[PDB]
Design a protein around this ligand. Sequence first.
Ligand SMILES: CCOP(=O)(OCC)C(=Cc1cc(C(C)(C)C)c(O)c(C(C)(C)C)c1)P(=O)(OCC)OCC
Length: 270
Amino acid sequence: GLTEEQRMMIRELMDAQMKTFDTTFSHFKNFRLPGVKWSQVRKDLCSLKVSLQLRGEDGSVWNYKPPADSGGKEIFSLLPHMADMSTYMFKGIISFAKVISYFRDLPIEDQISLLKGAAFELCQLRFNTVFNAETGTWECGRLSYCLEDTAGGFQQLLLEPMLKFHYMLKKLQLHEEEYVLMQAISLFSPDRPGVLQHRVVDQLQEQFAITLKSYIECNRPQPAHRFLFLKIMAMLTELRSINAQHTQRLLRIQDIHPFATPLMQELFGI
Ligand SMILES: CCOP(=O)(OCC)C(=Cc1cc(C(C)(C)C)c(O)c(C(C)(C)C)c1)P(=O)(OCC)OCC
């Protein structure tokens, strides 16, 4: 059964989510848009295969299809825009953290540390909920990011760790509570550099995992939801690896083509 404390914990997480997650992206506006030798690795954007769509309020539609590489010069046509969306997302994620309580009790520096450590993951997790595995696109309000699938690579070429992550996580068909919980576990990761009260955060993370584990055992009795809790935990360990992988990828690009926003600079190196 689920205890009173567990219940209050979920509600606090759920309350924090609806207060800070603008699922319609209504306040995402005034964002940039693509214009109208060891950089070969800097070509990490090889799987940045996303067409862009914008549903005009008046009913119109703008559709953007990206260029090609082998024209190494300027394949960052989509970076600025992308960075703005990340900032909007991050802002939302920081608001999520600061609105909990177990988080605000932690000393300031510990909040900063945990945030710089989980930003990517928390934002990555939120985007999964607006991801559509059918059309391979991320519905973000009037905005849309369609994967250049059945066009660019091939629907089996999910060799890209992150895409595999989104399809795989979407496949579990998690509930909102589960998403918020695995957003808590990620946020309160005791093993993130610079963490002071690591003993506290660690125990907090255990209470979250225990709650999620409980929730699953108390609301998903069917054979297909066996080991769900572990898959999710493994799923989150994977996410950490991508995170690190990404910070690096992102920094290489920054080292030769500045584009990161002030906020992005805060969270990461710069
Ligand atoms: C068009 C990008 O599609 P996408 O799915 O990855 C494709 C390989 C994607 C990944 C992503 C996520 C982040 C956060 C989570 C840390 C904010 C980024 O900062 C960045 C870049 C590298 C652009 C700086 C990319 P998304 O956040 O796009 C943001 C504009 O969308 C996730 C659904």
